[PDB]
Structures are given as structure tokens and as C-alpha cells.
């Protein structure tokens, strides 16, 4: 723990200098040995879950709870947590004369979260009775919702 | 801001009320029917609090005309008085043991022998707690009396 | 005597001391304004300052704070201890009279309490209902209602069960019609920036005030963000320099949502505060464990906070130390029977300690155990003294 | 100006996933209010030094900082090691009444909130009130009366 | 042998016990060294010949 | 960069938990050299350039 | 304790697993030492008797 943060200090010192996507994916200070003493595995006996369909449940229910216990420096996931994937078609992009920048802009402007405030705001005029929070366009959930994009 | 074509000025005070207000309007603190403010100190024990009774003693001279300090919620004199009452009971136990000692030995010097022992051992126990890194707290002075 | 009298004497942690101060929690129905909450904090300050002026010193009240626009906390100090004699002037009776007259206020859950000795254990549980399968908040709330309803309906073990998080209150929902938005000429960045800066403000820049940096805040005027149909105002400048109102490209409605979304260990959760019936913590915990098992699929349970210090032995530390003292005495008297006669005096002082504990109506606290061991030590100091000469 | 439907998902979720790779811990709570602010309240195992595990949290916090929203980075997060009991609260009033409610918290936040809390035994002091800030309360009518946007 | 074992209660509660379990034991040791060193000496110096 | 290697742009909520989204080419369009001649871009006079 | 606190940390997630998920331990070095030390203890007892 002494020299674990001597590294973190200079790491944060260098973080604003790294590229933007590197800051997005992020760096890490993983204090650990080099030997993965025990590896545990999860399978589906019935076969009702596929290869990619087994790493998500272990990354959304076990990858965070297990590694918050001591004696766990850095656990490597054999597989990967789910992510929404949009595999664009350059033909259909040009067939409508669109750039991948347009796709990125649309999905970044219509899947983001919103500052919304509240009715009956924090500094009031004397006499207001009802105060309630405002909600606007929130994130999307599944493939069907991402199918509908302007 | 916007510059109209007829040579007209559009400023921010034209379309907004500007005022030196509060950063947040969620918290208001009315003391006793009079508006006030203040801060609570989150958790040493008395050195922590006495080093703020003195850190704030440096800012009293240069306060504007009207500002007064109050201590509406304070738990340091609580312990500071409880421990002192335990010490008073210590002294009263010393005298109440001296009474029985004189009742049985009938001599000032004879009862002086057990009377000297208790404070010697008590100061020695203070020194031992200094050695083991313990603290003069609500529960150790009680052990000194016990 | 000793066994029956001692196993029948209840035990507790520590004496709740009059610290010259206490606090008052003020909770209001979800939706009330800061003015209507100040209306109740008003009565709190009124009671403390203008109901009985014998034990009140300074009632530091605060509106809109205490634990997290409808909450409040009343701090208060008491007069000097000498000026408050008797049980009728200690924190117990003061807060009792206070809370009893306080509960008679409509549309307000307000009650006073003392500061427990240590602020980590406090009242002897803290239940946690856990979303183990991502069921969602609006179904975990169904599970929580099912558990809360069938908890106080079995009062043979527990009552006064309640959730820590607060109940869902209506929320205003806006649907920005993306089609109409980009067709009329507005950009979504402009829409969301206008909405966020008009409702909630925005931290943009900083300025210097008297040789020190402070913040600036762009926000709506107070009289323009307190009505639903005021959302139809706040035009935006768009493609052909045209001003578009929100009522033309936004739908408005009421909805439901949680304002106190709790999470435990990284998963959605809801905490529950409750105590055992006037029964130990273990049996109440077991009843909660069974009742939590009678819940929809995917809902788990956990213990934390005021109950995790347990669930992981004084006779274990006694019975062996007894025979250790017996070993010392056996090396002392060069015998095995003689050392029994010294520890034969163990009940002789414990019986009197128990009699004096049950006399004043007190409890077997940590202090009582300390004094019990001290009296056992003195009983040994006497018995060994006698038996050494006798041998 | 946010909601629990937002900050639980746009800030709290991004933290609860990045709190991973740390020494002994007990549990990770989480709140989410209609005023935005979230407190996670990590916990020691009764045997870890305060300064030791105070920065094990800070490491993962900085690891997750570039992933949080922009205004969240502006207002900033904090690692406030402290207990839960505010032993002593001190108050400041004006006897003459020459200073109003909002006009008493500034002088205590620009002359006392920084000097007092730089002394040890002070984990996290909560200000009953708020430091001054310039406020521009815009008028949407006058904004549209001149055809201007916020 | 009766006062020391209390210093082994585990958790937030046993740390309370430790204070007595150390203070009282140190008090015994010091008072016994006193009854061995000072009390016999004082009995030899401050007692009237009977 | 988005056609070859993807890009981490936004995040979404899946069953009460945050996951990532990835804009990337379809598999069958990034495994040949001459596929680089495709992927036009919209430019000055709204024109697509290969 | 590091490994046994995961044999128990994962014992809490077994009830709520969907139909089909099974856990295996394909690479494990904790029973290796846990058995080697016990065999050393057995040799200790055998040396006592010998």
C-alpha cells in the first residue's frame, strides 16, 4: 500500500496528457503478483447459454462482488461483459449518403442523459405548494430501442 | 449580446436579474427565531476541539460589527465534566478509605502507609497507559477508581 | 438462586447518558415545499423554545437537511446539569413529553431522540433487501411492500418495521419529439441545454469577489420555473433564426419514480429498520430471514451496519480462565482439592451482584460484567488469604 | 438539477463498477437523491488504518473520474474520510440584524470554512448555508422578446 | 488470570473490554510491587512499637 | 478509426446496470485490403468521396 | 482465507443462478498446500509413535 499510490500519484499527473479515448477506457493501478493461483469457471450444462452468453452473467453478478474481497489484486475475465454493438454497413451508409460520424453523433445525442431539474425549483416564490423532479430522455435499454434512431 | 440593427444595445441585465446570491438554496438555518449560519465539525478528541476553540480565537478580533459566535451543540464538555467527576469520586474514595483506616489503626502515621499506596499506584498506572499507548478516557479513569 | 436470577436478568450494551443535547428528526410527505416544511420546523422550535423553559438552552434548527426539500433536523442543547434535577428533567423525560406532544401534528413524522453512546451499534437490526437478478426498482418495491406488510402482521416477534428509503413520488416527464425537433429546425443540444439551465441551473464560470474566487450560476428567475405549463415557454433560436416553444415539440405528463434509490454492494437495494419485540435480536433476525425467503424470485437479503458486529462467548472466556486460576492455585497449595475451596466462593459474590443489579431495575451491561469480575477477584483475594493460613 | 433515475445510473453505476481491486472492505452502501448528490460510504474492517484505505478508494476514484459526466467533474467528487457523528456544531449570528440569512454563510465560508477545516480531527465539515455565488436569474420572456437563447 | 482474558473479545465491543483488561491488570502489578517494596518499608518506618 | 477497431462513444442501461455501446464495421466489410477503397465520406458539397 | 473467503463469497450467489449454470474449479492450488501441510502433520504424528 505504500508504493501502490506512489505510482498512482504520477499516474494522475500523466492522465490529462494521454489521448482522449485512453482516458475514456481508463488506466489502472493494479497491485498484484503474477500467479493466478485459482481460476474458476462457469458453464451451462443444458446449453441454453452460448459462449458470449456466459461471460455477461459472470461479469454483471460476480466480477464486481468477488473482486471486492481482499486477496484479490487484479482478476482477468476469460470473456467479456456485454456491450451493445452496432455493426454499420458502409454500403447502406453511402446508399443513403451518410458518414459514420453521423451515426456517432446520432447515438451520442439520443442515448445520453439529461439535466432536468425540478418543478417548484430550489429558490421558490412564496406560495408554491407542489415540488417534483423533472425527467427527460434517459438512456435506452435493448436492441429494439436502439433500432429507432433519428 | 445581440446588437440590433438600429444601434440598440441588448445586455444581460436587460434580460436577467443579477444578484450576489447563495450557491445553494436547499439549506436554511434559523437559530432561535433569528437567521444564522454555522458549521459542524466531523471527527484527537479534545485537542481536536480545543485546537478549534483556539483556531477560531484568532478570527474574533477582525469580525464585522454584529457577528457573534454560539455553541448550540457541544459534546466535548460532556466528557470533560464526566471524567472530572470520576476524578472527584476518586478523591472521595481516598478520603472514605482514610476514614476506615483511621477507624481501625488509630494513628495518622499507621494509616498513612496504605494511604500513600493508592496514589502511587494510580500515577504508575497513568505511566503504564503512557507506555501501552492507552488513553485517559471515559472508561479507564473509571477503572482507576474501580 | 444465582442461576435462576441471572439467566432471567436481561442484558444491554451501555447506559444512555444525558449529554446535555438531543436531536429532532422532521420528515414530511414527499412533495411538500421548503415553506411548508419550515411551517413544521416552526412548531418544533416553538415547542422547544416556548413550551417548558426549565431545561432548554439553544435550539439550533435546520430546514432541508439531516439525512440523505421536505426534511429537517432540530439540534438543541440543555441548560446546566445542576439546573435540571431529577428524572423529570433528564433527556429521557424531556424527549418523551416532546415526542408525545409532537406526534399530534398533521402531515408530519417528527420525533426527538438522544445521541447513543457509540454511533456505530446504537439500538440492538438493519435489514437489506437486494435486487439479485436485476428485477428493477418498481418490482423490488413490490417485494419490499410484500415483506413490510407480512412483517408487522406477526407481532409475536416484531413490530414497527419500516423502510429506510422513502416512497416513490410523482415526477414530471418530458418527451422531446426528435422528429419534430429536427424537422422544425432545432438541435437537441440546444433543447437539453435550455432545459437544464432553465430548471436546475448550470455551473459555467467563476469570478473574483473581494480577492477570492466564487462561482457564477445561470438559472431561471424564480417566478418562471414553478408551474407545469411554464414548460411551454422558453423558446429556442433555430435554423432560420426562428424561436420555437417547447409546447410545440415536447409532450408533458406525470409519472412515478424513486427519489431515494438505495444500493448495497453495487446492486439496487432497500434498507429496513426494525427492532425485536420486548425476544432477542437472534430470533427476530431468523424471522426476517424466513419472511425474506417468502418473496418473489430473484430477491435476496443481507445484514449490515448495526447487526454485522454480531453473527460471527463470555462463558468461553470464563470457563477456561476458571481452570487457569485453578492451575495457579494447584501450584500454590500443592493440591487439587484445596484449590476447589477457593473457587467455591465464585457464586458468593455473583449472587449479590445480581441481586443489586435486579434491585434498581438495571441491566447486565459491560459495566456489570466488569464489576462482577472485580468482585470475583476480591472474593479470591479473601478466600486465598484464608486458605493459605489454613494450609 | 438531476434525479435519482439519472445520478444512480450516470454517476453511481460508473463508480460501483470501478470500485474494484482494493484491500479489505466490509460493504458498499449507496444513496441517490433528487438533488443529485450520491454518497457511497465504503467501510473499513475495524483493523485498517484510516490513511491506508483512504487512498485505496482515491485510486479507483481517479480511475473512474474521466468516465463521469462533465458537470460532475466540474462540481467534483471527494474522498472524505470521517466518522458519522458531528460532535460539535458552532453557529454565527448577527445581533444587530445588519446581516441577513444568506448574508451570514458567506463570511463564514470565505474566512472560516477553509481555515478551520485545515486542522486535524476535521474529516468533512458540512456548511449550514452556502458560500456566495453570482446568480443571473434570466427571464425567458425578455430572452424571447429579443429572440435569444440561454 | 481473571482480568486479562477480557482483552480477547473480538469486534467493536471487546475493545471496550480491553481498557479495563489492561488498566486493572497493570494496577494489580504496580500495587503488588508496592506491597512488596514500599508497604513493608513504611511498616518498618511508620509504626509504633507495641 | 471507427470502421477499423471501433469506437467507445456512449453507454446504456441493461437490466438495471450500465454497459458500453460500440460503433464498429460489420464483420464482412473489414477483412480485405481493397475494402479500404470503400467507406465514402460526406464533404464540402455534400459529396461522397471514397 | 483469501481463497476460502471466495469459496464462501461465491456460495451466496449459487441459489439465484439461472437454470443451467454450473461452477467448476479447473485450476486450483489451494488444496495442494492444504493437503501437503496435513501430510506433514501426519508425518509428525507418525514420528511421535515411532
Which chain C residues have a beta carbon less than 8 Å from that of A135? 171-174, 255, 257
Query: Residues in chain C whose beta carbon is closer than 8 A to a beta carbon of chain F?
Result: 131, 134-137, 268
Provide the pairing of β-strand B16-22 with D132-138: antiparallel
Q: Which helix (H) or strand (E) holds C353?
A: helix C346-359
- Cβ atoms < 10 Å from Cβ of A20: 8
Residue A108 maps to which CATH number?
Answer: 3.30.2090.10
Best B3, B23, B31 residue to mutate vs chain D (most D CBs within 10 Å): B23
Smallest Cα distance from A86 to chain G, Å: 28
3-class DSSP string for chain A: CHHHHHHHHHHHHHHHHCCHHHHHHCCCCCCCCCCCCCEEEEEECCCCCCCHHHHHHHHHCCCCCCCCCCCCCCCCCCCCCCEEEEEECHHHHHHCCCCHHHHHHHHHHHCCCCCCCEECCCCCCCCCCCCEEEECCCCCCCHHHHHCCC
Integer Cα distance of A89 and B37 in angstroms: 62
Contact D1 A72 (CB under 8 A): no
Integer Cα distance of C190 and C234 in angstroms: 11
What the block records as the C-alpha cell of C95 is 424527549
Which chain C residues have a beta carbon less than 8 Å from that of G14? none
Which residues are registered as beta bridge partners of B41? D88
What are the CA-CA distances from residue C314 to residues C196, C320, C322, E15, E17 (Å)? 60, 10, 12, 14, 11
Which chain C residues have a beta carbon less than 8 Å from that of D8? 261, 263
Which among C118, C312, C321 has CB closest to E5?
C321
Which chain C residues have a beta carbon less than 8 Å from that of D5? 171, 257-258, 261
Q: Strand, helix or coil at F20?
A: strand
Give C333's contacts (C-beta < 8 A, 6+ positions apart). Answer: C339, C387, C388, C391
What the block records as the C-alpha cell of D119 is 486542522
Integer Cα distance of C351 and C372 in angstroms: 10
DSSP class of F13: E
Contact A88 F12 (CB under 8 A): no
Assess contact for C274 and C158: CB atoms under 8 A.
yes
> What b/e sequence results for C249-277 when a residue is b if at least 16 CB atoms lie within 10 Å of its CB, and e otherwise?
bbeeeeeebbbbbbbbbbbbbbbbebebe
Q: How far apart are the first and last CA of chain A?
A: 50
Contact D137 C220 (CB under 8 A): yes
Select from B28, B22, B34, C72 the least CA-distant residue to D128: B28
Provide the pairing of β-strand C213-220 with D132-138: parallel
Contact E8 C309 (CB under 8 A): no
DSSP class of B133: T
Contact B73 C61 (CB under 8 A): no
Maximum alpha-carbon separation in chain D: 65
Assess contact for D11 and C261: CB atoms under 8 A.
no
Instruction: State the residue range of the domain holding A93.
Output: 80-150
Q: Say how many CA atoms lie within 13 Å of C276 toward its Cβ.
A: 14
Give B19's contacts (C-beta < 8 A, 6+ positions apart). Answer: D134, D135, D137
Integer Cα distance of C257 and C172 in angstroms: 10
Which among E19, E39, E43 has CB closest to B143?
E19
What are the CA-CA distances from residue B59 to residues B64, B68, D108, D120, D123 (Å)? 11, 11, 10, 18, 21
Q: Say how many CA atoms lie within 13 Å of A127 toward its Cβ.
A: 4
Measured in degrees and rounded to the nearest 5, phi and psi for residue B67 equal -75, 125
Assess contact for A146 and A120: CB atoms under 8 A.
no
Residue A149 falls in which region: left (phi positive, over 0), alpha (psi -120 to 50) or beta: beta
Could you tell me if D98 lies within 8 Å of chain B, comparing CB atoms?
Answer: yes
DSSP class of C234: -
Q: Which helix (H) or strand (E) holds C57?
A: strand C56-58
Which chain A residues have a beta carbon less than 8 Å from that of C39? none
- Mark whether C and A touch (3+ CB pairs within 8 Å): yes
Partners for F (CB, 8 Å, 3+ pairs)?
A, C, D
Q: Which helix (H) or strand (E) holds D92?
A: strand D88-94
Burial of C69 (0-12, 13-18, 19+ CB in 10 A): buried
Smallest Cα distance from A24 to chain F, Å: 8
3-class DSSP string for C139-150: HHHHHHHHHHHH
Size (chain F), residues = 50
Smallest Cα distance from B145 to chain D, Å: 27
Contact B144 E27 (CB under 8 A): yes
Partners for E (CB, 8 Å, 3+ pairs)?
B, C
Radius of gyration, alpha carbons of chain B:
31
Which chain B residues have a beta carbon less than 8 Å from that of D127? 27, 37, 39
Experiment type: X-ray
Integer Cα distance of C47 and C170 in angstroms: 33
Best C134, C172, C193 residue to mutate vs chain A (most A CBs within 10 Å): C172
Query: What is the count of residue pairs from A and C with beta carbons less than 8 Å apart?
Result: 109
Residue D45 falls in which region: left (phi positive, over 0), alpha (psi -120 to 50) or beta: alpha
Which among A114, A122, A131 has CB closest to C196?
A114
Could you tell me if C264 lies within 8 Å of chain A, comparing CB atoms?
Answer: no
Give C331's contacts (C-beta < 8 A, 6+ positions apart). Answer: none
D1-82 architecture in CATH?
2-Layer Sandwich (3.30)
Which residues are registered as beta bridge partners of C25? C73, C111
What the block records as the C-alpha cell of C167 is 416512497
Integer Cα distance of D144 and D150 in angstroms: 10
Minimum CA–CA partner of C136 in chain F? F16
Interface list for C 216-275 with E (CB within 8 A): none
Best G9, G16, G17 residue to mutate vs chain C (most C CBs within 10 Å): G16
What the block records as the C-alpha cell of C109 is 413524522
Interface list for C 51-110 with B (CB within 8 A): 58-65, 69, 75-77, 81
Which chain B residues have a beta carbon less than 8 Å from that of A122? 24-26
- Mark whether A and G touch (3+ CB pairs within 8 Å): yes
Could you tell me if B120 lies within 8 Å of chain E, comparing CB atoms?
Answer: yes
* Segments of D43-83 assigned E as strands: none
Which residues are registered as beta bridge partners of C77? C21, C58
Integer Cα distance of A137 and A131 in angstroms: 20
Interface list for C 152-191 with D (CB within 8 A): 171, 190
Integer Cα distance of D25 and D48 in angstroms: 9
What the block records as the C-alpha cell of C61 is 434548527
DSSP class of C167: P
Minimum CA–CA partner of C298 in chain G? G16
Which chain C residues have a beta carbon less than 8 Å from that of B75? 19, 21, 115
Amino acid at each position: 500500500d505504500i508504493a501502490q499510490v506512489q505510482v498512482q500519484n504520477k499516474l494522475q499527473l500523466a492522465m490529462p496528457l494521454l489521448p482522449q479515448e485512453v482516458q475514456q477506457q481508463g488506466v489502472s493501478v493494479e497491485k498484484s503478483s503474477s500467479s493466478f493461483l485459482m481460476v474458476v469457471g462457469v458453464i451451462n450444462t443444458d446449453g441454453t447459454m452460448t459462449q458470449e452468453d456466459i461471460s455477461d452473467y459472470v461479469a454483471a453478478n460476480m466480477k464486481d462482488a468477488i473482486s471486492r474481497t481482499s486477496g484479490v489484486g487484479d482478476v482477468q475475465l476469460f470473456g467479456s461483459q456485454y456491450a451493445m454493438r452496432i455493426w454499420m454497413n458502409p454500403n447502406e451508409l453511402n446508399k443513403f449518403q451518410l458518414t459514420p460520424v453521423d451515426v456517432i453523433t446520432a447515438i451520442k445525442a439520443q442515448n445520453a442523459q439529461v439535466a432536468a431539474g425540478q418543478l417548484g425549483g430550489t429558490p421558490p416564490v412564496k406560495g408554491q405548494q407542489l415540488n417534483a423532479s423533472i425527467i427527460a430522455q434517459t438512456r435506452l435499454t435493448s436492441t429494439e430501442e436502439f433500432g429507432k434512431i433519428l | 449580446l445581440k446588437v440590433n440593427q438600429d444601434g440598440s444595445r441588448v445586455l444581460l441585465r436587460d434580460v436577467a436579474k443579477i444578484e450576489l446570491g447563495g450557491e445553494n438554496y436547499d439549506i436554511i438555518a434559523e437559530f432561535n427565531g433569528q437567521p444564522a449560519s454555522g458549521l459542524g465539525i466531523k471527527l484527537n478528541a479534545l485537542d481536536t476541539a480545543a485546537a478549534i476553540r483556539a483556531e477560531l480565537a484568532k478570527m474574533e478580533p477582525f469580525f464585522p460589527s454584529g457577528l457573534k459566535i454560539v455553541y448550540p451543540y457541544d459534546t466535548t464538555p460532556f466528557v470533560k465534566i464526566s471524567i472530572h467527576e470520576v476524578v472527584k469520586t476518586l478523591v472521595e474514595a481516598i478520603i472514605l478509605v482514610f476514614l476506615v483506616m483511621y477507624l481501625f489503626l488509630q494513628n495518622f502515621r499507621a494509616t498513612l502507609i496504605p494511604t500513600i499506596a493508592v496514589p502511587v499506584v494510580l500515577l504508575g498506572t497513568f505511566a503504564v497507559l503512557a507506555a501501552f499507548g492507552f488513553s485517559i478516557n471515559t472508561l479507564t479513569m473509571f477503572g482507576m477508581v474501580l | 438462586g444465582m442461576a435462576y436470577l441471572f439467566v432471567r436478568l436481561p442484558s444491554s450494551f451501555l447506559p444512555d447518558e444525558d449529554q446535555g443535547v438531543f436531536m429532532t428528526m422532521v420528515q414530511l410527505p414527499a412533495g411538500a415545499t421548503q415553506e411548508r416544511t419550515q411551517k413544521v420546523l416552526n412548531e418544533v422550535t416553538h415547542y422547544y423554545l416556548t413550551k417548558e423553559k426549565n431545561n432548554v438552552e439553544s435550539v439550533f434548527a435546520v430546514n432541508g437537511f439531516g439525512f440523505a426539500q421536505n426534511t429537517g433536523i432540530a439540534f438543541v442543547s440543555l441548560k446546566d446539569w445542576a439546573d435540571r434535577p431529577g428524572e423529570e428533567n433528564k433527556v429521557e423525560a424531556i424527549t418523551m413529553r416532546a415526542t408525545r406532544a409532537f406526534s399530534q401534528i398533521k402531515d408530519a413524522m417528527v420525533f426527538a431522540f438522544n445521541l447513543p453512546a457509540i454511533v456505530e451499534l446504537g439500538t440492538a437490526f438493519d435489514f437489506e433487501l437486494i435486487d439479485q437478478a436485476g428485477l428493477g426498482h418498481e418490482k423490488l418495491t413490490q417485494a419490499r411492500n410484500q415483506l413490510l406488510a407480512e412483517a408487522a402482521k406477526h407481532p409475536d416477534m416484531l413490530t414497527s418495521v419500516r423502510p429506510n428509503g422513502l416512497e416513490d413520488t410523482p415526477q414530471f416527464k418530458i418527451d422531446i419529439d426528435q422528429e419534430k425537433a429536427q424537422a422544425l429546425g432545432v438541435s437537441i443540444n440546444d433543447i437539453n441545454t435550455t432545459l437544464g439551465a432553465a430548471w436546475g441551473g448550470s455551473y459555467v464560470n467563476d469570478f473574483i469577489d473581494r480577492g477570492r474566487v466564487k462561482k457564477v450560476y445561470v438559472m431561471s428567475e424564480a417566478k418562471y420555473r414553478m408551474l407545469p405549463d411554464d414548460i411551454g415557454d422558453w423558446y429556442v433560436r433555430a435554423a432560420d433564426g426562428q424561436m420555437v416553444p417547447f409546447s410545440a415539440f415536447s409532450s408533458s405528463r406525470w409519472e412515478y419514480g424513486s427519489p431515494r434509490l438505495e444500493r448495497y454492494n453495487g446492486l439496487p437495494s432497500m434498507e429496513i429498520l426494525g427492532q425485536a419485540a420486548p425476544k432477542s435480536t437472534g430470533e427476530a433476525m431468523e424471522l426476517m430471514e424466513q419472511l425474506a425467503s417468502k418473496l418473489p424470485t430473484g430477491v435476496g437479503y443481507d445484514w449490515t451496519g448495526m447487526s454485522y458486529q454480531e453473527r460471527l462467548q463470555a462463558p468461553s472466556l470464563y470457563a477456561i480462565s476458571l481452570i487457569v486460576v485453578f492451575l495457579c492455585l494447584a501450584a500454590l497449595y500443592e493440591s487439587w482439592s484445596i484449590p476447589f475451596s477457593v473457587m467455591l466462593v465464585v457464586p458468593l459474590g455473583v449472587i449479590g451482584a445480581l441481586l443489586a443489579a435486579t434491585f434498581r431495575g438495571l441491566t447486565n451491561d459491560v459495566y456489570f460484567q466488569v464489576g462482577l469480575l472485580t468482585t470475583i477477584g476480591l472474593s479470591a483475594k479473601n478466600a486465598i488469604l484464608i486458605v493459605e493460613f489454613a494450609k | 438539477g438531476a434525479d435519482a433515475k439519472t445520478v444512480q445510473d450516470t454517476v453511481t453505476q460508473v463508480i460501483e463498477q470501478n470500485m474494484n481491486g482494493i484491500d479489505n472492505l466490509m460493504y458498499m452502501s449507496s444513496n441517490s437523491d433528487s438533488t443529485g448528490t450520491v454518497q457511497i460510504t465504503l467501510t473499513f474492517e475495524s483493523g485498517t488504518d484510516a490513511d491506508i484505505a483512504q487512498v485505496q478508494v482515491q485510486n479507483k476514484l481517479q480511475l473512474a473520474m474521466p468516465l463521469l459526466p462533465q458537470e460532475v467533474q466540474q462540481q467534483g467528487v471527494s474522498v472524505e474520510k470521517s466518522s458519522s457523528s458531528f460532535l460539535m456544531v458552532v453557529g454565527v449570528i448577527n445581533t444587530d440584524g445588519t446581516m441577513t440569512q444568506e448574508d451570514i454563510s458567506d463570511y463564514v465560508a470565505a474566512n472560516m470554512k477553509d481555515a478551520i477545516s485545515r486542522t486535524s480531527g476535521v474529516g468533512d465539515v458540512q456548511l449550514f448555508g452556502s458560500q456566495y455565488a453570482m446568480r443571473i436569474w434570466m427571464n425567458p420572456n425578455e430572452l424571447n422578446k429579443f429572440q435569444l437563447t440561454p | 488470570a481473571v482480568f486479562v482474558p477480557m482483552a480477547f473479545f473480538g469486534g467493536s465491543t471487546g475493545a471496550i473490554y480491553r481498557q479495563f483488561s489492561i488498566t486493572i491488570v497493570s494496577a494489580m502489578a504496580l500495587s503488588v510491587l508496592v506491597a512488596l517494596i514500599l508497604t513493608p518499608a513504611l511498616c518498618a518506618t511508620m509504626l509504633k512499637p507495641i
